[PDB]
Design a protein around this ligand. Structure first.
Ligand SMILES: *[C@H](O)[C@H](C[C@@H]1CCNC1=O)NC(=O)[C@H](CC(=C)C)NC(=O)[C@@H](NC(=O)OCc1ccccc1)C(C)C
Ligand SMILES: *[C@H](O)[C@H](C[C@@H]1CCNC1=O)NC(=O)[C@H](CC(=C)C)NC(=O)[C@@H](NC(=O)OCc1ccccc1)C(C)C
Lengths: 301, 301
């Protein structure tokens, strides 16, 4: 037992991380087959990236795979990412996919500087399409991902930090998550909400792990719960979310709408100096899958 | 900016993980050079491990490195770990050290099942020599570690779960952390305390990240703070801890004893519905080093 915010093993991604330097900007790139993907704002000089890229030549891009130099033999733009064709295919290329995730889903971030991995952590895509990451200057180009057996699904590439200290980025096709642009003009995150289905998943994790103090036999209808959700800035719960929680409900014997009544009481009353899985807040960055994966012990390779 | 519970990149350790099966027990081993290290309780049949090991032969130990089979050519006991000599040296062996950590220090855990990594997370060695991990049956032999540039310092191997759902294990020389034994007789964790120097480090992280609401100009003496610490089951703060916090104090301009006065008030008053770095509790599983590493961006390889 126990419950931790747990990231995927990062080895498969570490082997894809390279350094990309152009002019005076250094950031990280993702080296898959014979292409290096990186944020287009690496390109030199309110910007017009099509302008800036035609003035650029292959030899302007310094790509370093650890120590070995990578010769760039072509370049192109795809939305907000740059694709640098290099003359060597990464021999460590995993089975991979480029997937775009939904708000409320989680992924692991391999934070990198100068092409070298610094640390791994888990987070969620917020309803407002930001992520609450940990990123310093030089971290751009770090990626987020999920692993399913042996396949890496890349879902995020880091581009910027917004004024509230939250982070914004693209999928690996270069399309931003949310209404953000890779310009340094004034932009703001937009109002966020709590990911209700994840909070319920985490309450099931707590029951699986022996925290039961918040349980009751008060029940509720989906409609009556959603009136309470709206009041506390929680996202609406759908019948699909109820279905997705089915397995956890079956494992614990607590009906989904019964757990909703527990959450209603927690929202209206607080926790009264108590904790749930070591937290004094209702945690919303664990998906139902994350809970099942971590309380049945699924592995990868 | 941002602040996350962040683990070391796990690639270097993933390449050392193997599966060890003997009789009907399967668990994980650590493959370094031509030795596989694993918990001695893998051995077949209130146990006497010296008895049990002399009855054992090399061919009883089934060691699997992914798909490739590893031929065991010798075995010996070292305290509570078994050392299985195999006929092949792990070509992925990193630069490594076996270090024993102190209560209050942190490390990354690569949770494994059947020799395959499942996830990575960070935790601390508690003052009572347990760890609050996330471990299910089959996870024994998973290791904890820190990385310093290119060198892996292994500090923990997982052995058991105690009745409160916390975890106990050994260093890589096979010596238990704390007063625990690898028998399934009744054992209990012992009363824990909060790691004061880490809470102060985390408050400095909060200031570095823009949370300042808990600050004040009330100051305190080390002696007067430690009277408050004892009352709230916090560990004593030493002059050495004050020195260790020096750099963070210098970076933020908040004297260590001034931050102690802030912590005094937080302990006596609570947080009054507010949060610090996304938590409604005082967090104690970040060391001063963890804070500096994550707010200056140190990397590894
Ligand atoms: C790439 O390594 C960095 C990573 C960035 C540095 C600190 N934390 C991070 O995640 N990214 C950048 O430097 C980008 C470059 C870009 C093309 C936009 N710039 C930023 O992240 C700035 N953010 C920004 O300009 O957002 C819009 C904005 C909002 C409010 C006022 C002005 C502009 C950031 C460093 C200030
Ligand atoms: C190895 O894969 C497992 C990992 C364990 C399973 C569930 N979570 C874990 O971390 N370890 C064991 O099965 C060990 C074997 C051993 C040599 C002691 N057994 C346990 O972890 C049991 N713990 C235990 O017996 O602790 C002492 C105790 C305390 C109270 C009553 C009786 C015994 C655990 C599975 C019950």
């Amino acid at each position: 037992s126990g419950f931790r915010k747990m990231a995927f093993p990062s080895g498969k991604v570490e082997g894809c991380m390279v350094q990309v330097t152009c002019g005076t900007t250094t950031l990280n790139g993702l080296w898959l087959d014979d292409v290096v993907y990186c944020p287009r704002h690496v390109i030199c000089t309110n910007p017009n990236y099509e302008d800036l890229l035609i003035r650029k030549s292959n030899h302007n891009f310094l790509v370093q795979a650890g120590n070995v130099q990578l010769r760039v033999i072509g370049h192109s733009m795809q939305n907000c990412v740059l694709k640098l064709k290099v003359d060597t295919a990464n021999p460590k290329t995993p089975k991979y996919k480029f997937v775009r995730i939904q708000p409320g889903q989680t992924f692991s971030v391999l934070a990198c500087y100068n092409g070298s991995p610094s640390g791994v952590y888990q987070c969620a895509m917020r309803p407002n399409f930001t992520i609450k990451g940990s990123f310093l200057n030089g971290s751009c180009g770090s990626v987020g991902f999920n692993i399913d057996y042996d396949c890496v699904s890349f879902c995020y590439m880091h581009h910027m930090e917004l004024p509230t200290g939250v982070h914004a980025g693209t999928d690996l096709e270069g399309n931003f998550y949310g209404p953000f642009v890779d310009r340094q003009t004034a932009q703001a995150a937009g109002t966020d909400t709590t990911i209700t289905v994840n909070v319920l998943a985490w309450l099931y994790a707590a029951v699986i792990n022996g925290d039961r103090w918040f349980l009751n036999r008060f029940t509720t209808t989906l409609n009556d719960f959603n009136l309470v959700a709206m009041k506390y800035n929680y996202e609406p719960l759908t019948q699909d979310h109820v279905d997705i929680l089915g397995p956890l409900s079956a494992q614990t014997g607590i009906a989904v709408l019964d757990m909703c009544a527990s959450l209603k009481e927690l929202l209206q009353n607080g926790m009264n100096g108590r904790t749930i899985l070591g937290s004094a807040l209702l945690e919303d960055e664990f998906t139902p899958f994350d809970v099942v994966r971590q309380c049945s012990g699924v592995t990868f390779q």
